[PDB]
């Protein structure tokens, strides 16, 4: 067990690397989700506006 625990500290920096990588991956996943959501909002917003313009021109006609 001396061996096991001596090298647990030797591979603790690798543990930190693994941790940070996983956390960053999850954070980027959430960022992607939020990016998609904002883009969806923009797509929808444009449909709403385009209609309110087909109806605006319809009023003119």
Swiss-Prot record:
It is found in: Endoplasmic reticulum membrane; Endoplasmic reticulum-Golgi intermediate compartment membrane; Cell membrane; Cell projection, Lamellipodium membrane. Changing residue 49 to P: In DHS1; gives rise to mechanically activated currents that inactivate more slowly than wild-type currents. It comes from the Eukaryota. Residues 30-59 form a coiled coil. Expressed in numerous tissues. In normal brain, expressed exclusively in neurons, not in astrocytes. In Alzheimer disease brains, expressed in about half of the activated astrocytes located around classical senile plaques. In Parkinson disease substantia nigra, not detected in melanin-containing neurons nor in activated astrocytes. Expressed in erythrocytes (at protein level). Expressed in myoblasts (at protein level). Homotrimer; the homotrimer forms a propeller-shaped Piezo channel with a cation-ion conducting pore. Heterotrimeric interaction may occur between PIEZO1 and PIEZO2. Interacts with PKD2. Interacts with STOML3. Interacts with TMC1, TMC2, PCDH15 and CIB2; the interaction may be part of the MET complex. Interacts with MDFIC (via C-terminus); the interaction prolongs Piezo channel inactivation. Interacts with MDFI (via C-terminus); the interaction prolongs Piezo channel inactivation. Piezo comes from the Greek 'piesi' meaning pressure. It is linked to Dehydrated hereditary stomatocytosis 1 with or without pseudohyperkalemia and/or perinatal edema: An autosomal dominant hemolytic anemia characterized by primary erythrocyte dehydration. DHS erythrocytes exhibit decreased total cation and potassium content that are not accompanied by a proportional net gain of sodium and water. DHS patients typically exhibit mild to moderate compensated hemolytic anemia, with an increased erythrocyte mean corpuscular hemoglobin concentration and a decreased osmotic fragility, both of which reflect cellular dehydration. Lymphatic malformation 6: A form of primary lymphedema, a disease characterized by swelling of body parts due to developmental anomalies and functional defects of the lymphatic system. Patients with lymphedema may suffer from recurrent local infections. LMPHM6 is an autosomal recessive, severe form manifesting as generalized lymphatic dysplasia. Belongs to the PIEZO (TC 1.A.75) family. Pore-forming subunit of the mechanosensitive non-specific cation Piezo channel required for rapidly adapting mechanically activated (MA) currents and has a key role in sensing touch and tactile pain. Piezo channels are homotrimeric three-blade propeller-shaped structures that utilize a cap-motion and plug-and-latch mechanism to gate their ion-conducting pathways. Generates currents characterized by a linear current-voltage relationship that are sensitive to ruthenium red and gadolinium. Conductance to monovalent alkali ions is highest for K(+), intermediate for Na(+) and lowest for Li(+). This is Piezo-type mechanosensitive ion channel component 1. The lineage of its organism: Eukaryota, Metazoa, Chordata, Craniata, Vertebrata. The chain holds residues 1310 to 1370 of 2521 of the full protein.
